[PDB]
Amino acid sequence: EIVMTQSPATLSVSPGERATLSCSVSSSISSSNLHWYQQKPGQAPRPWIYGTSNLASGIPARFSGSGSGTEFTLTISSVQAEDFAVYYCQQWSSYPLTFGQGTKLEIKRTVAAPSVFIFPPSDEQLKSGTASVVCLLNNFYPREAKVQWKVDNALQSGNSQESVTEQDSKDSTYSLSSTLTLSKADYEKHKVYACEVTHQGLSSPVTKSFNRGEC
Amino acid sequence: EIVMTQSPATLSVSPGERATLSCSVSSSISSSNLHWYQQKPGQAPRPWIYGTSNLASGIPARFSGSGSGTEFTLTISSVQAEDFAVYYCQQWSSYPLTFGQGTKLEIKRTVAAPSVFIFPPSDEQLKSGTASVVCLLNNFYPREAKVQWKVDNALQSGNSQESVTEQDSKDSTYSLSSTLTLSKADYEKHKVYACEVTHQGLSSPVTKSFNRGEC
Amino acid sequence: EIVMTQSPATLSVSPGERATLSCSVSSSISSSNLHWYQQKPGQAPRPWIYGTSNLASGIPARFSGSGSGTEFTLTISSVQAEDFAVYYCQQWSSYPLTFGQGTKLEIKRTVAAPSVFIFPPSDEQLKSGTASVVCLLNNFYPREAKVQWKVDNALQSGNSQESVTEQDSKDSTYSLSSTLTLSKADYEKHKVYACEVTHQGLSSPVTKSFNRGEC
Amino acid sequence: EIVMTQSPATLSVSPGERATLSCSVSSSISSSNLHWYQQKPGQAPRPWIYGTSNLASGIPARFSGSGSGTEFTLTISSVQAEDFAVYYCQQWSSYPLTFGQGTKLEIKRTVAAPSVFIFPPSDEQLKSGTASVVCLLNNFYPREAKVQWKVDNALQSGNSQESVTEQDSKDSTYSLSSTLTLSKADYEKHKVYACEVTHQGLSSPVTKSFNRGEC
Amino acid sequence: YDFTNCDFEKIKAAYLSTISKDLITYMSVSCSNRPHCLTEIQSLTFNPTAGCASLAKEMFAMKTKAALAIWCPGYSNKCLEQVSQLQGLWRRFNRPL
Amino acid sequence: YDFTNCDFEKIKAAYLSTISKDLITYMSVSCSNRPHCLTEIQSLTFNPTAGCASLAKEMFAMKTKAALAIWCPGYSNKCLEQVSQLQGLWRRFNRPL
Amino acid sequence: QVQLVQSGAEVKKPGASVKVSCKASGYAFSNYWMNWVRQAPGQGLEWMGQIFPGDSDTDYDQKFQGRVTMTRDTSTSTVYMELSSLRSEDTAVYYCARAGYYRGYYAMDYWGQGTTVTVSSASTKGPSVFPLAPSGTAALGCLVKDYFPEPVTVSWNSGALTSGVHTFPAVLQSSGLYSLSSVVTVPSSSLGTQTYICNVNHKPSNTKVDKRVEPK
């Protein structure tokens, strides 16, 4: 089949700047056979550019497209608030139809360090036979942030899950929640639980730690 | 036939600016049915824009087209020195094929008043049997310059032929030569011959006069 | 002695401009009898201009001198980043040698209002036997900033010592720290302690107040 | 002795520009021992700069001097109308005192082609036994102009003398007069006398010729 | 099916913009008027011929079917020679009236 | 000649600006006050000494004579050692009052 | 106006089959192909196939061969996509896209809102909400753990508190159930003077839980 490679995976651009999304195609295809779709989270994809150059109805003049053969490009002269979304390049040339993996046009802002909080498991959860230790990295930018779980200064892996909120509407920051799940016996088998955060906005990784039994 | 008109007849645009050329069609035609051609003096027209929107082979990305039904436009984002030429819009909807009158995209510059000279007919021409009085309007801009011939302070018309050079390469100015052709009898029935020039760069029309007899 | 004065005391000149330093001598002295020296903080003065007009060894052509009798001037045509220092005019006419008070040629920039913080004395200081309340005026320009201490909304003076950092290298701003030193009894006889700052960059004086007891 | 070399011999600078006059010295001399004098035509030299840097009384701030060892320089920041004159650098270091050959600060203007006239010898001069044929190159710039005398198409040399007026006060142009002197027998021995002018303002050398006996 | 009542201009635009490109990339007789031409394209694209029968499932054939369905009321080697004839029929279809 | 009534500041300026330079370029005892110093410079520059007698026609000697004539009312090896002593006398002359 | 309204969200067991409907309105149904595409959670679009309503001529993707079957009903202007032998990675949002010409260019010009099909072996289970107590700003939270299926709506103070509330997307742990957390930052001086009720609603299990968060 036709392999549709999009670059970059995410594009952090500040509002009002110029954005360029590249789409490489495994085989040479006609310009008329490649189209661009825009999708916002929680919404269906919307036809955005037809035939690599023709905007659909309602798309403003900021968007443009250009390319041929195995290289195509979507360009936004002045990115506005409503332009931040996932863009897909879709070829029509041969079956099966293939879409690009999608480029997420993302708001770029000043680097903000996260606020790191640690929540020990509640007593009810312990009575339920499981312990979930939560680490919250609130209001940070950019998205890339590393969370490590140290149980009695021993690094942990394979038992923690991370959730990231969408980019905030007001300050365009992210929030991350890393939950470390353990059995009651395993949780009571140790004393010190620490969440270590490595982020660009922090000069050194910040460790939030607690001990069992503290009030 | 489909009578289709171009605006403006002459487009004065300095290099680097944005140029827009309008083509209005008497009857609504398909978008794919309109083509744009570029012609330079002494050369055949070149297929330039396809189907109101598609650039031909080799035409740079500066040129674009957009329109439907009756109204179409050819737009250059940044006019370069090589883009000054005559652009024709042509319909491909039905026979007979019709072309626009042509829009002469030409270099804009500061208004310059012509230097006006007058040359009486030479002795050789007078012995030949005719007399050609020449009025030279050298290095003027814009092209619109208006000339009358006065014979014994009386307006004369219908027997003067004028020719204008193409826009100059180095200073983008025009030059005009108006020749008033008379017989011998007409030439020696009068004493004063005058050329009156009205132009944008002149506060008042300039009159250059000569009298027969002087060396 | 010959009492000889420099003007202005502080010269605010942005880099690249022209700077003029005036030296006025109580009694008329010979032109060859006046010398100019440059001093940078933590360094010995450097012989800089000879006999009111002669540059010393290594001093570039930017510096010049001109004057006679009572009035002399040192002029820099294009002030560079290395030219901000204290300049002294010194007479060589008669004993005792006398120097000018010095002109501090210093970087000029846009007016910036200080960020004002107040720090109450720590617990360790309180157990030591004294109390030092600190008022910090961080990143302000010009250097002229004026500070009062209010104790229970009553003016206090004669027991506060302030120190100002040298002009910053990267943003050319100042920082001021005013320490109000009191005994224990004086500290716990009052409830509200305030620092009031008046500066050019403030529309109104800013008052930062604290109350004893809060953590 | 000390050889004082000045450069250039003449310096054509337009009014309001920056002028630099160089003085090389055959031996290293003190800065205080080299002075600059200004002379205008028909006037005595005037002391202009003392000790390579010190303007005399009345010389404006435009003039400055700088140098050492075997290289010194006179600089005028903005040449004015009264600055066009001959400048000499004079060393004092050793006897005999030596002056530079002089640099003539000269007005620079637009290149103007000469008007070439030829005057045959008058009848009275022929009765006197000598013939002087005069060639006049009126109102030309720059000074460099070549005049050649062709007698019956034969080049002449060694019997012509040229006089050049000073630069004009109004249009800053030159006039040249080349007089070719011959005996009466030599003058009557030939027929065609031509003056050929080669100048920068002329595309080709212009020849003004006459024949004996013409009225 | 009679193509007399089709919207010929929209079909022509669809071919000139989209169908023609696929028709050429597949390379790697005549007709009297527009309805007759469209009849010829229909027959020569979707009706199997001797040998080159798999032309009905090609992408340009899908485009032709889509355009005909949208803009015709009630509509809904040897291969190289067939596609050359199809190009000729399409070119004569695009001829101005 | 007594140098009591001379203009010492102008002579000092002339030396510091002009005469000193020639005095050093020629290279390739003490005095009590300014008049005594100037007496010493006069004697040590213009009066011939043992051997180094040609010092009176040197350029710095011409400068010293010019300055003294202008600013004194009524005024108008071994060589290296003599010029070093002259430099010392001039340096002590320039001493502030 | 062109509308493609699809069926509701589906929860299916592995090995079962799902029929996603897509009713088209506002235009001539039989003249335009319906493509079916799917978007996996956190992944890009995946073309499943296409059907021509005029005559039921279907072209399926090679990987969905024998598993997807597309039918149409012209009486109701509806298009049905039957995905059989469902397995774990068929959980996705399925879109029906009408494909037509815009100025001569052929692309998927209209899309349906999509149907969320969750193929999991877990059964419906109510959420267990636990407090996340704080230690000048402090964060409170409620951890909503072990519920199925998605979603649960978490409000604070019955919707009065909305500023500073971050409700993280649910994650599917190894147990096959979902777990999210809702956090809110409030000034640390109002922790004891304010009642903090987090309201968890799980419609599939019809569960309303009100959890009151207190400092520890």
Add this chain to the structure above:
Amino acid sequence: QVTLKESGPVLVKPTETLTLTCTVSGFSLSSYDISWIRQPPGKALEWLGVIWSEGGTSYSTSLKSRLTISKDTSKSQVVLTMTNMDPVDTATYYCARDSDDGYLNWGQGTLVTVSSASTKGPSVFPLAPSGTAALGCLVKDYFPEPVTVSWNSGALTSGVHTFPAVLQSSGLYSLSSVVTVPSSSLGTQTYICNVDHKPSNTKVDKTVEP
């Protein structure tokens, strides 16, 4: 590659017959239809008429009775025949292959001059001058166009304007070449204009003097 080449430029007497042959390469006449478009000097393009790939032909309504477009696919030639010519029919004629995208895909273009005036040498008359002064020379009554005008055997180039030839009422052409020079240079420098006409093989050097 697609190329269209008309015959050479021609002179046609009034009320005679124009026959132009356009040879094409890179395509067959049986698959593409060839149009003929004429452009009068300084005017817009006028579509004369088309001959179609199957053999049909269409002509402009105004010129339907005079046009005849024939086609020979064996020789790859398209022949335009226009009868009863008028001096208003002088123009540049192009044969253009209406392409796949619809664009005319023009040819080189051939100049056709419809005039009864025989070849005539030019007559040069010096337009003498009276801070710069303009002089020149008027070339009159020559046929056919063009005439090469130079100054000082190509030495004088700055300020030289050679206006386009204008067809006078007598069917002959006339232009003027004017150069601007400093007034001081009139006396010394000698200005001569060289007028060269290949068809009449006439080379005239005219000296312009005040």
Add this chain to the structure above:
Amino acid sequence: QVTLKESGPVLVKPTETLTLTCTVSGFSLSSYDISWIRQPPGKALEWLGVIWSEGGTSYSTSLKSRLTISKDTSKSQVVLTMTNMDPVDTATYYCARDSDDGYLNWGQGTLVTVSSASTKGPSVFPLAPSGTAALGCLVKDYFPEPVTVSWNSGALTSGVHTFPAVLQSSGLYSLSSVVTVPSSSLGTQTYICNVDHKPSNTKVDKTVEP
């Protein structure tokens, strides 16, 4: 080359005697006269007094009774002796050779501290903070100057201001080091200031917490 080097920086008890030795090289003491100039911290240069090449000496009128400048040409040394010192006499003292052109031609300069306070270790007190917040630590009651203050063992440098030490009424010094940091970083990042005093050999790490 001409060089003038005073003795090392000294601490002089009040009402004691200052003796400074300036060693000079590149010239003889018998030909040049050496001046002594003191500059109080943050004030203008004060000319203490000169000793002349022939042996004479002159002193400032205010300090005539206390100054004594002696000279040893054999050792090339100039000795300044100042009696009855006052804590107002702490300053940087320079020996300068009045040159041929008259310029002082300064030396390196030696720091003299006139104080009776013995060496004392510093006391560090954390100035705790209450969109950016400033924190710091106050170093108090140390002698003698200076104290090296760093943050996070040199890791934290941006926004760090270490004000000059001020001599309090007790004769001891005190300064403050303040750093501005984002308010979000107070909880996670731990801020410690390291205060190092070589003369008292005291190294104190103080953790600043809200």
Add this chain to the structure above:
Amino acid sequence: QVQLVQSGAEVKKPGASVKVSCKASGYAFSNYWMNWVRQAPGQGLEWMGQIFPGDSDTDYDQKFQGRVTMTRDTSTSTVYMELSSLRSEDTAVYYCARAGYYRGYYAMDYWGQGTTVTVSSASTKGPSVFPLAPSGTAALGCLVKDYFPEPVTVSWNSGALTSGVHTFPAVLQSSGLYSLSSVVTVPSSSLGTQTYICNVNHKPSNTKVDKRVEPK
């Protein structure tokens, strides 16, 4: 004010001797050296020597050794320079320059107007003026040839015509006499309607010649 007023212009035969005077006024005469320098026509300055008026101590240039002798007269504050054995290249403008200090710098701070000394073997001779007739602007002229010594003053129309008049510097031909030309450009239409009189004055020979220029 300081004034150095010198004697008049001198015309001397080769092998003769010239005494150039320079009277100084406005300052103390005996305190400043007089340097004597010379400027050849069209060449740079040439230092001849110096004298101290206080005591007559003279330093001469090496090339002027035995030829120049400088004396002073303090009664009249005058300095005399005696240049003997005059030859062809001694023709120059001789300047007396008082040299003094300005702000400590020693240079020739005051100069006299200079005396033009012409050492030529030719005797006084009146000028011969000849017309230079023209052929919209035409040039008229008068050639003033074979006169000695410099200068001659040439006016046009008794000074009425001054615009466009160029009087070229005189040149010394091989005969030892001077020859210059005065030209004037006038419109070619006024040649016959205007009387053109050129007035040549030679004071050394006391010659007044009025030459009327007509077209040929």
